[PDB]
């Protein structure tokens, strides 16, 4: 469901 | 939120989304109380009967959001946790007494039109506003129904604080002075409640004396969602303010 | 300090669509 977030945050 | 409405843009700039990393999911609501501190419910982070015990690195806080699922490029800010502080007498065994936790962010978040901290009440704020019949406001990305289901954007509902005897008589759970309940009675005809995914989010009130928003409550527990004869229960922020101050002054 | 004053509402003297409901319940 959730749009993926910028990798920098994972 | 059940039977609430869409939030306006920038209506709740202290709103915080607790987001799980893997799997990427909504964990709870939460609130921004300064440029590095976020307040939520202890049960959002620690609940051993369900084997819940999230570490810092298990999640992210997302601030400035409106849409639930979208990555809001140039609007939201995503932050990493430095340290989680749960109330040392949070009573998950019995009744979620002292359902409160603090999260320190690794770096300060920049305030903006969409990101801004809410006030915490002092004794007189509490005394003045935490009155049966007085309405507060609850916000979250939680379910729209106890069992249409999930909102596209942040939901809002205003609810009256309920007399302590009514609160107590509505449940078999032992109610404490660290809790209050809010919601309409069946006789009042109107509806609204927090629900699954709204946990840890804020119950706010706008002081008519200085026109500022105060968070009096934290979405803590309830039985079902928006059931006739049942009320949402809220962690009483002012009552645990001593613990809050102690934490932030120490760390 | 700045707390509780929303950039898009109190700071600009705009009200949101239901804060009046709260105010009216404050006795
Ligand atoms: N407004 C509300 N109607 C409302 C309903 C439900 C919640 C929360 C919370 C909820 O009501 N419970 C159940 C519960 C409730 C009371 C308890 C418990 C357990 O143990 C001792 O006393 C949860 C437990 C982690 C503790 C938590 C759960 C998390 C997803 C949604 N639930 C939030 C709001």
Instruction: Give residues 14 to 33 of B whose Cβ lies within 8 Å of C.
Output: 33
| Atom nearest to B232 CA in ligand 1 | 1
Instruction: Answer yes or no: do B205 and C22 touch at CB < 8 A.
Output: yes
Q: For residue B138, list its beta bridge partners.
A: B157, B203
Q: Where are the domains of chain C?
A: 1-27
For residues B139 and B202, what is the distance between their CA atoms, to the nearest angstrom?
7
Q: Which CATH class is domain B1-12+118-238?
A: mainly beta
Q: Encoding tokens for residue C6? A: 């929303």
* CATH number belonging to domain B13-117+239-250: 2.40.10.10
Provide the CA B47 distance to its chain's centre, in angstroms.
17
| DSSP 8-state secondary structure symbol assigned to residue B107 | S
Write down the catalytic residue from B12, B79, B170, B199.
B199
By CA distance, what is B78's nearest residue in A? A9
Could you give the C-alpha distances from B167 to B1, B2, B85, B158, B228, in angstroms and in order?
Answer: 20, 19, 29, 18, 13
| Active-site residue flag, B87 | no
In sign, the C-alpha dihedral spanning B68, B69, B72, B78 is positive
Does ligand 1 lie within 6 Å of residue B97's CB atom? no
Q: Where are the domains of chain B?
A: 1-12+118-238, 13-117+239-250
Listing from the earlier edge strand, what are the strands of the sheet with B179-182? B5-6, B155-160, B135-140, B202-206, B213-221, B232-236, B179-182
Q: Ligand 1: which residue has its CA nearest to atom 27?
A: B221
Q: For residue B234, list its beta bridge partners.
A: B180, B219
In units of Å, what resolution does this entry have?
1.8
Long-range pairs for B241-247: beta carbons < 8 A, 24 or more residues apart: B241/B120, B241/B121, B241/B122, B243/B87, B243/B98, B243/B100, B244/B39, B244/B100, B244/B102, B244/B120, B247/B85, B247/B102
The count of residues in chain A is: 10
> Does B211 contact C at CB distance below 8 Å?
yes
For residues B117 and B111, what is the distance between their CA atoms, to the nearest angstrom?
8
Q: Encoding tokens for residue B185? A: 């009675």
Contacts of A2 in chain B (CB under 8 A): 19, 24-26, 69
Asked if residues B241 and B120 have their Cβ atoms less than 8 Å apart, the reply is yes
Write down the catalytic residue from B12, B87, B97, B99.
B99
**Pairing state of beta strands B179-182 and B202-206?**
unpaired
| Active-site residue flag, B5 | no
Does ligand 1 lie within 6 Å of residue B222's CB atom? yes
C1-27 classified as CATH 4.10.140.10 = yes
């Amino acid at each position: 469901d959730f749009e993926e977030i910028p990798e920098e945050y994972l | 939120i059940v039977e609430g409405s869409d939030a306006e843009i920038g209506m709740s700039p202290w709103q915080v989304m607790l987001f799980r990393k893997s799997p990427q999911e909504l964990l709870c609501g939460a609130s921004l109380i300064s440029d590095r501190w976020v307040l939520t419910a202890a049960h959002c982070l620690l609940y051993p009967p369900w084997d819940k015990n999230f570490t810092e690195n298990d999640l992210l806080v997302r601030i400035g959001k409106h849409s639930r699922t979208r990555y809001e490029r140039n609007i939201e800010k995503i932050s990493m946790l430095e340290k989680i502080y749960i109330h040392p007498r949070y009573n998950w065994r019995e009744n979620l007494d002292r359902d409160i936790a603090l999260m320190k962010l690794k770096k300060p978040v920049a305030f903006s039109d969409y990101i801004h901290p809410v006030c915490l009440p002092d004794r007189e704020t509490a005394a003045s506003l935490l009155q049966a019949g007085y309405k507060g406001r609850v916000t979250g990305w939680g379910n729209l129904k106890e069992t249409k289901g999930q909102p596209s954007v942040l939901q809002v509902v205003n609810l009256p604080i309920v007399e302590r005897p009514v609160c107590k008589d509505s449940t078999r759970i032992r109610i404490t002075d660290n809790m209050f309940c809010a919601g309409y009675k069946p006789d009042e005809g109107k509806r609204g409640d927090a629900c699954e995914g709204d946990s840890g989010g804020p119950f706010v009130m706008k002081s008519p004396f200085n026109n500022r928003w105060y968070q009096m409550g934290i979405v803590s527990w309830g039985e079902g969602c928006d059931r006739d004869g049942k009320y949402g229960f809220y962690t009483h922020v002012f009552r645990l303010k001593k613990w809050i101050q102690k934490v932030i002054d120490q760390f | 300090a700045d707390c509780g004053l929303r950039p898009l509402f109190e700071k600009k003297s705009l009200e949101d669509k239901t804060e009046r409901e709260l105010l009216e319940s404050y006795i």
